[PDB]
Symmetry: C2
């Protein structure tokens, strides 16, 4: 993020014209090459290289050729980057010094899904709702109101039920100088603890299941109360269609007098451990709502080890924002969300003092958030999350689609 904000080349896009302004005061851009690329949802469509001839503090206007205009659905992204072909005393040949990304043109998807002939079958007991479709099967706990288990064939997919999460392992900016002796009431973590966000217990309000003409509809409503006070209300809809897909719509109400929650999303512990994490979204590196400018939208494939940031004092980490599709093993999650995936739960990160004491858990912990609070950074002893990055709207909606390899 520091490298991107400190670039010596600034970029402006106007139609098909890229304006490059040099921030150098003395040198001419004699070791600079501009590589541009246009991709559609991570699929490259066109590319080109233009040498840079910019005087100190000057501007070079670069007219792109006729860019591709795909009729397939998706967003067009234009990425430029400055490459140094020759090695310097402080850098090697091929060094990238500056980059920028834009959205070019989006074709909204209007095509309907294929008319699947099958219908998921719903069985009702006193303890659970069971939806069965082919080899796949879902189970909803009627006492808890959460999806408890999913089976592909005879293999369980979950170790922990899929539940709403409103907290994160506190960052160093969340803690401040709030020691166990000199408590800091203004610290974010102290306000969350005093409000009971870490101790709030979910209470089921309603849970119904209806069979549609082509799907199965599951509706749940939970209330998170702490000492006779409702902090959050979550209303969730599960739509299991005949194609195997699972659409999850979540509507959340947050009390205005409680401190703004750190996140609004779901979490679960997947039984499967996989080697690669593939997602279509922002950046190869971890990024957050107020630290995502350096990240780029593309198709990224990383090993699961690179999805975890080894901070000395464990905390919430590894978040990727602006993600439209996430693939892990046989599971695919689509929507507009942020996620982090690792072998350590948020509970373990909160209780472990140093990273060398962290131990991997049995499965994979996945946190998918519709919304996430920004991180601080102006200082580390006082609250420094700006108002535009706090979760203060009061009402929140997000949708998720969960499908499999079929």
């Amino acid at each position: 993020e520091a490298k991107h904000q400190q670039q010596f080349f600034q970029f402006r896009l106007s139609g098909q014209t890229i304006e490059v302004t040099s921030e150098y005061l003395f040198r001419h851009s004699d070791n600079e090459l501009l590589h541009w690329m246009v991709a559609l949802d991570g699929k490259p469509l066109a590319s080109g290289e233009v040498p840079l001839d910019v005087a100190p503090q000057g501007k070079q206007l670069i007219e792109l050729p006729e860019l591709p205009q795909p009729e397939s659905a998706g967003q067009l992204w234009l990425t430029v980057r400055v490459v140094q072909p020759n090695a310097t005393a402080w850098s090697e040949a091929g060094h990238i010094s500056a980059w920028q990304q834009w959205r070019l043109a989006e074709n909204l998807s209007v095509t309907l899904p294929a008319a699947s002939h099958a219908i998921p079958h719903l069985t009702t007991s006193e303890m659970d709702f069971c939806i069965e479709l082919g080899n796949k099967r879902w189970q909803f706990n009627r006492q808890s109101g959460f999806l408890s288990q999913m089976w592909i064939g005879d293999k369980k997919q979950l170790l922990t039920p899929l539940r709403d999460q409103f907290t994160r392992a506190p960052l160093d900016n969340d803690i401040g100088v709030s020691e166990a002796t000199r408590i800091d009431p203004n610290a974010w973590v102290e306000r969350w603890k005093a409000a009971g966000h870490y101790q709030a217990e979910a209470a089921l309000l309603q849970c119904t299941a209806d069979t549609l003409a082509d799907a199965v509809l599951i509706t749940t409503a939970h209330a998170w109360q702490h000492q006779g006070k409702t902090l959050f209300i979550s209303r969730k809809t599960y739509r299991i269609d005949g194609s195997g897909q699972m659409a999850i719509t979540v509507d959340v109400e947050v009390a205005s007098d409680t401190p703004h929650p750190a996140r609004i999303g779901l979490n679960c512990q997947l039984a499967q451990v996989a080697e690669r994490v593939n997602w279509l979204g922002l950046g190869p590196q971890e990024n957050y709502p107020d630290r995502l400018t350096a990240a780029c939208f593309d198709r990224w494939d990383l090993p699961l080890s690179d999805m975890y940031t080894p901070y000395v004092f464990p905390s919430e980490n590894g978040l990727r924002c602006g993600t439209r599709e996430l693939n892990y093993g046989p599971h695919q999650w689509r929507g507009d969300f942020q996620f982090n995936i690792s072998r350590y739960s948020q509970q373990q990160l909160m209780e472990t003092s140093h990273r060398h004491l962290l131990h991997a858990e049995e499965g994979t912990w996945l946190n998918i958030d519709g919304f996430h609070m920004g991180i601080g950074g102006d200082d580390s002893w006082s609250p420094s999350v700006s108002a535009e990055f706090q979760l203060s709207a009061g009402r929140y909606h997000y949708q998720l689609v969960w499908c499999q390899k079929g």
Copy 2:
């Protein structure tokens, strides 16, 4: 457009696309849930293309057959207010005659909006949610085509515009775009819910 009977309600699902010259501008997915108590829950999800200019509003409109004398709502301000001109407004229960819900600007335009409204009552109809509304006898089409306010004529019924989201108004100057980025509808995806009930 599908209709399903639930255990206690009737579910209506629709999806529309707004296209102009071979290009989809907006997609609206709407859900209607008519329960046994008489209530009508309407959930709207809207997709806006990123390359099209940001829309001025995202909501619904209809012409009610009934004309009533008083407009009662629980929301912001007695006077008209907009996303970037609502600081002076106050949240309370307001009751105004329908005439005061229209602002007589010399050159007709969109007017009379009330923001931050949780409940709106007009005749036997009640609308609940988190929305902005304007109510008057002139349609948005008539306001666009009428040069001066003295040429405005009331229509047969009442025109109601309920918006989940609304673009801010300018004011820094009148010759150049002056709506700030935080008041433009640039999110791309929008959701809002409405409940429509009656006197029962």
